[PDB]
Amino acid sequence: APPVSYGVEEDVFHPVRAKQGMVASVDATATQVGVDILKEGGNAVDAAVAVGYALAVTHPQAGNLGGGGFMLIRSKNGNTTAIDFREMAPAKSHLASGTPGTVAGFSLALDKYGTMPLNKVVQPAFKLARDGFIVNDALADDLKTYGSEVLPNHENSKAIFWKEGEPLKKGDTLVQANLAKSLEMIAENGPDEFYKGTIAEQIAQEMQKNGGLITKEDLAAYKAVERTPISGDYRGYQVYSMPPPSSGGIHIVQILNILENFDMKKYGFGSADAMQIMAEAEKYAYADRSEYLVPWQALTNKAYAKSIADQIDINKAKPSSEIRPGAPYESNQATHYSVVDKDGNAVAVTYTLNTTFGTGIVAGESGILLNNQMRPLSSMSPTIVVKDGKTWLVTGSPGGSRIITTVLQMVVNSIDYGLNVAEATNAPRFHHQWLPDELRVEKGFSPDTLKLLEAKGQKVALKEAMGSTQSIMVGPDGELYGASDPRSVDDLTAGY
């Protein structure tokens, strides 16, 4: 068993620490909402919902009431479950936004696994919409970059997110009064407000105004669905992740299974050998994923993984064309957060509108942004790892197909390389989807190593940073270690 490290004084990257509870998310305020919920006495699910609602207010890039996403929960005793709240397609300039799942997704989780009434968990987000919050670098930058095509051309969006002809900038106060009302209603009347009430008619009457497809009938007919987590075994660790309609859960396990046939620890992080194995292994799994967009579950098979492990050549890449002939668009945009309470319950959530700010259309006078989901597949893969019979790592990322490899490297860097949670996070990342046939890398790999890979038949391609991991590692004694991605300005891991 490869020895693990939680972090020591002498390391370059230090995990955020806490003894009782911890939250890692893309936004500083959201994280604090989360911690404060734990601090009131809520469980991990209580806090995760609060974080999810806060993010709906403070990260309209991707945090939402008008989208959907995935959630994995592991309880203290071992019960692991997955909640699919992916946007549903409707029974059918125009418009294309699937029936939003987030609210129905949180209620199920809160009604089944939470201890707090919805009204207590919405409250911090409601205050954030009502009273407003000060815009930071991440929000301002994303408003200038992404919101410019698609926000200001719609009057109600404009009114919320623009002021005096320009996107709000750093220092400005974003008050969201229409959202405050939506949040106050859901608090009051439960999730039915969204699916059968004022919000439902608001969504429907903004859908009916412009193009749009979802009826009040689509809304009344939406449910989140609890599903069996995909599970695998990697060197005595258990790895749980999201099933279909995650396109990634299955394939994080398939790659791990492939990788197990190698002594990864021997040759550490960043070595040509190790990067070749993972690249080739990924390439294969991505080649198999191609057929799904022969049961899908099947290729989590350990024996089948060995079969493709035996094919892998440490000294020669095999052309992607030679594996199989030769995937539809997917946004790098989404957001992940992780939560661990003092009792040891752990939650991983990853959720999204399709692209940043979705359609950029707010559903009438609700204050809620509508997703552009054109039940669709997604590589989102909230993932929980279990060591010596206990929750050990909770992680996840946005980044389209690259979520698979990003989550994978967190796991591999922690299990194989002995990296503390913060080192795993700040480590350079690499990536091979089979098409295009290229070993995608970030900065920070040795040119010596890069040329060795090149000699092996890998077409090394230096491209933009991948993902936004927001992870928590758990010690056997309840001690918590956390790390937010440097790749996202203004993120926070905090606890108490």
From Swiss-Prot:
EC number: 3.4.19.13, 2.3.2.2
Residues that coordinate or bind L-glutamate: R86, T352, N354, Q373, S378, S379, G399, G400
InterPro entries xrefs: GGT_bact, GGT_CS, GGT_lsub_C, GGT_peptidase, GGT_ssub, Ntn_hydrolases_N
The protein's annotated pathway: Sulfur metabolism; glutathione metabolism
Active site feature: A334 (nucleophile)
Effect of R487G: Not processed into its subunits, loss of enzymatic activity
Disruption phenotype: Loss of growth using exogenous gamma-glutamyl peptides as amino acid sources.
Family: Belongs to the gamma-glutamyltransferase family.
Subunit-structure text: This enzyme consists of two polypeptide chains, which are synthesized in precursor form from a single polypeptide.
Name of this protein: Glutathione hydrolase proenzyme
Taxonomic source organism: Escherichia coli (strain K12)
Gene for this chain: ggt
